[PDB]
Amino acid sequence: SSQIRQNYSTEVEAAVNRLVNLYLRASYTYLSLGFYFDRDDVALCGVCHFFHELAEEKREGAERLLKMQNQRGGRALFQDLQKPSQDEWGTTLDAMKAAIVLEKSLNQALLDLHALGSAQADPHLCDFLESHFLDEEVKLIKKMGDHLTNIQRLVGSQAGLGEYLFERLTLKHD
Amino acid sequence: SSQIRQNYSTEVEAAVNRLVNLYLRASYTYLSLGFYFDRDDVALCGVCHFFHELAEEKREGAERLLKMQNQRGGRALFQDLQKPSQDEWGTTLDAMKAAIVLEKSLNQALLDLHALGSAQADPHLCDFLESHFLDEEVKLIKKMGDHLTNIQRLVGSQAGLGEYLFERLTLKHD
Amino acid sequence: SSQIRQNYSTEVEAAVNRLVNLYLRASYTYLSLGFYFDRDDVALCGVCHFFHELAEEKREGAERLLKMQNQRGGRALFQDLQKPSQDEWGTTLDAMKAAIVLEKSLNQALLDLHALGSAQADPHLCDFLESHFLDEEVKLIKKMGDHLTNIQRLVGSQAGLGEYLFERLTLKHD
Amino acid sequence: SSQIRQNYSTEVEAAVNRLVNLYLRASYTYLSLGFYFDRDDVALCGVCHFFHELAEEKREGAERLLKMQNQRGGRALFQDLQKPSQDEWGTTLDAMKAAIVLEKSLNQALLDLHALGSAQADPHLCDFLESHFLDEEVKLIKKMGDHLTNIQRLVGSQAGLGEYLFERLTLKHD
Numbered sequence: 001s002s003q004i005r006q007n008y009s010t011e012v013e014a015a016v017n018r019l020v021n022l023y024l025r026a027s028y029t030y031l032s033l034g035f036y037f038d039r040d041d042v043a044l045c046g047v048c049h050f051f052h053e054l055a056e057e058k059r060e061g062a063e064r065l066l067k068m069q070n071q072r073g074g075r076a077l078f079q080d081l082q083k084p085s086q087d088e089w090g091t092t093l094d095a096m097k098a099a100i101v102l103e104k105s106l107n108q109a110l111l112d113l114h115a116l117g118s119a120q121a122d123p124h125l126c127d128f129l130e131s132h133f134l135d136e137e138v139k140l141i142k143k144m145g146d147h148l149t150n151i152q153r154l155v156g157s158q159a160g161l162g163e164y165l166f167e168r169l170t171l172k173h174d
Numbered sequence: 175s176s177q178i179r180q181n182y183s184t185e186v187e188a189a190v191n192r193l194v195n196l197y198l199r200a201s202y203t204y205l206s207l208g209f210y211f212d213r214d215d216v217a218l219c220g221v222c223h224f225f226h227e228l229a230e231e232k233r234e235g236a237e238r239l240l241k242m243q244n245q246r247g248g249r250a251l252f253q254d255l256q257k258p259s260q261d262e263w264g265t266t267l268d269a270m271k272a273a274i275v276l277e278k279s280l281n282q283a284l285l286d287l288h289a290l291g292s293a294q295a296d297p298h299l300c301d302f303l304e305s306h307f308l309d310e311e312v313k314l315i316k317k318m319g320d321h322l323t324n325i326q327r328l329v330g331s332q333a334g335l336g337e338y339l340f341e342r343l344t345l346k347h348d
Numbered sequence: 349s350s351q352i353r354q355n356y357s358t359e360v361e362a363a364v365n366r367l368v369n370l371y372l373r374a375s376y377t378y379l380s381l382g383f384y385f386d387r388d389d390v391a392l393c394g395v396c397h398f399f400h401e402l403a404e405e406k407r408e409g410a411e412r413l414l415k416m417q418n419q420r421g422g423r424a425l426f427q428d429l430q431k432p433s434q435d436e437w438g439t440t441l442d443a444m445k446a447a448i449v450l451e452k453s454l455n456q457a458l459l460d461l462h463a464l465g466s467a468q469a470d471p472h473l474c475d476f477l478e479s480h481f482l483d484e485e486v487k488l489i490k491k492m493g494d495h496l497t498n499i500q501r502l503v504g505s506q507a508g509l510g511e512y513l514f515e516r517l518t519l520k521h522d
Numbered sequence: 523s524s525q526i527r528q529n530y531s532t533e534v535e536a537a538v539n540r541l542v543n544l545y546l547r548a549s550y551t552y553l554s555l556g557f558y559f560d561r562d563d564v565a566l567c568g569v570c571h572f573f574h575e576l577a578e579e580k581r582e583g584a585e586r587l588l589k590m591q592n593q594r595g596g597r598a599l600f601q602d603l604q605k606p607s608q609d610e611w612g613t614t615l616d617a618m619k620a621a622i623v624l625e626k627s628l629n630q631a632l633l634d635l636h637a638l639g640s641a642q643a644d645p646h647l648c649d650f651l652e653s654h655f656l657d658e659e660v661k662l663i664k665k666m667g668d669h670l671t672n673i674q675r676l677v678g679s680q681a682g683l684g685e686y687l688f689e690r691l692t693l694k695h696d
Contacts, residue, residue, distance in 0.1 A: 001389045002319070002387075002388050002389055003274065003322055003388060004274070004315050004316055004318070004319035004388045006278055006281055006282070006315070007281075007282075028426070028429070031411075031414075031426075032424065032426050035414050035417075035418060035424050038415070038418045039350075039418055039423070040350050040418065040421060040664060040667035040668055040671060041349045041350055041351065041667075041671055042671065043667070043668035043669075043671040043672055063379075066379075066383050067386070069383075070316070070383060070387055071313060071316045072312065073316075073388060075387070076380065076383050076384070077435060078379075078380050078432055078435070079431050080428050080429060080430055080431050081376070081428060081429040081431075082428055083426045083427050083428050083429075084426055087425060087426070121285075121289060121292075123288045123300070123303070123304070123308055124308050124312055127304040127305075127308055127309060128309070158678050158679065158680065159678075160674075160675035160676060160677070160684075161675075161676060161678055161680065161683070161684060163675060164675055164676055164687070164688075164691075165687070168691045168692075169691075316388060319388035319389075319391070320388055320391035321391075323388060323389055323390065323391040324391055324512060326508075327508035327509075327511060328509060328512055329508070330506050330508045331505075331506065332506065332509065336508075336509060339509075339512070339513070340512075343512075343516045343517075344516075350667070351667045351670055351671070352622070352663050352666070352667035354663070355629075355630075355633055418664070419660050419661060419664045420660065421667070469633075469637060471633065471636045471648070471651070471652070471656055472657065472660055475652040475653075475657060476657070
């Protein structure tokens with residue numbers, strides 16, 4: 001039961017639970033991506049930090065959604081977290097491409113949820129998705145697109161050299 | 175007169191004045207609630223601080239609305255402030271129930287005003303109600319619901335003991 | 349491929365991947381447990397912190413196992429993460445009971461893996477499970493048993509009061 | 523004579539002396555490796571620091587083993603230290619390959635000694651090899667495998683450029 005629920009549709013409640021699952025799944029994908037880059041036959045430190053930072057960001061996003069669910073009087077429902085789509089992620093380029101596709105899918109899910117909030121006249125939901133979701137997604141996708149462009153320019157005829165240099169000079173950590 | 179008014183409907187201007195009255199009335203209710211808990215035959219310090227903090231928050235909300243009214247070129251109009259609905263507020267439980275009802279009514283007034291802003295295509299109003307009103311209300315109502323649940327679990331067969339313990343261990347101050 | 353693998357059986361590699369899944373599943377269970385205690389109709393702050401701290405600990409355990417997998421030249425393989433066994437977790441007592449059962453299952457999985465390491469004559473694995481897994485589990489299970497005993501002594505005839513007091517006086521945070 | 527020897531087999535005592543010789547020999551190999559990279563016709567600063575750090579680590583390992591030998595009441599016996607297997611070590615890649623082979627041989631000697639300790643029911647020996655030998659070896663071999671992968675990706679068609687960049691950007695010092 002809840003003593004607090006107000007202007008919070010069952011449709012939005014369900015969509016929020018699905019978005020939690022999508023964020024957690026994204027986090028799990030990023031967990032796998034980072035560890036792949038820590039394989040001794042891959043060994044790109046900076047790429048591990050990049051994807052693991054994202055794993056943490058996605059988990060935090062899910063956690064924020066769950067906090068909001070409870071603030072509104074909705075009820076968290078968890079589903080299975082599907083294993084990531086690949087066991088091996090190819091080159092830094094392949095991985096960054098998969099990451100952009102992943103983010104675009106999360107972004108579309110956010111847009112769909114915002115549209116649902118508008119349809120349900122739920123301005124708190126609208127406000128919430130703004131800060132910490134919509135703008136963060138746009139910024140993250142821009143960063144990934146920038147990375148992709150730099151990775152692509154570094155392939156040329158010497159892909160190994162380019163991959164090393166990108167990790168050394170773009171993906172620094174700490 | 176005003177030299178600044180732009181995209182600010184008479185409908186919104188009037189609704190903002192009514193919302194100021196509702197916030198001030200809420201502040202007055204909270205003033206009364208707190209002092210009731212300071213009666214020598216009631217004597218629950220933590221409950222006084224809880225409601226008096228809310229009295230201050232509600233007054234600040236009204237003040238923000240009035241500042242916004244002037245920023246938009248609307249004109250403040252004050253009405254009587256109706257005395258609070260009760261002279262005596264019963265138990266901490268009774269009081270917390272009355273407080274939740276009060277807040278839900280303010281929240282509904284905010285939602286009605288946001289809807290009016292949408293209908294009048296007034297995005298500044300929309301932005302304004304977001305921060306410092308909509309999200310604050312949701313958070314406050316969640317806190318009150320949490321309190322209610324804890325108060326309710328403490329009644330059992332020993333209501334006096336439970337009421338004392340809630341004030342001592344949940345409603346600490348300073 | 350790997351250029352580093354030495355004395356690391358396929359049996360242990362597979363068992364390590366399964367243990368990663370078990371730790372992640374435990375983390376997910378704890379995520380759900382904590383949020384349940386943040387429902388407005390449950391509202392036990394200290395219990396949320398307790399289970400969320402464990403969610404973090406379990407995720408870190410999985411992460412350590414994955415780091416070790418790569419250090420040994422094994423290959424991480426992720427599987428679905430099964431949703432937690434319950435959507436609603438009952439009383440603090442019910443939850444603490446479920447947590448102890450969960451931990452005992454993880455502990456048994458650690459013991460099974462240590463036995464496999466002994467059978468495969470893999471002392472690095474043996475060393476690894478020692479620190480940060482075996483002793484941490486024993487300590488955690490002891491803490492949970494202590495909590496259970498205290499929760500049980502607090503039920504008596506006044507379960508609501510006891511549940512509140514345990515959260516207030518045992519499960520403090522920060 | 524000794525007044526302290528307890529549960530310390532002559533087999534383990536002898537194996538410990540042989541392991542001291544292997545560690546010292548490894549240290550000597552690393553001494554040679556580093557100085558080769560300081561030849562004016564080789565001139566790779568970072569590679570000198572990398573191998574000289576290892577020379578120090580291996581000497582310290584031998585010293586720890588000798589301290590333990592005396593703690594157990596065994597008697598140190600030194601043998602000749604065979605000169606390193608090469609006078610000239612080729613490319614950074616050739617050298618890193620030779621280093622991995624060297625480390626794998628030390629690791630195997632540690633595993634053989636741990637097995638002997640198990641066979642002789644000597645848990646102090648078991649404990650000792652754990653910390654500061656077994657786990658350090660695994661970590662070091664993982665680092666070397668990572669280096670090898672990076673060196674290999676940098677060869678491509680421009681080996682000179684790749685060798686310079688690895689030394690500049692991976693093997694920094696101080």
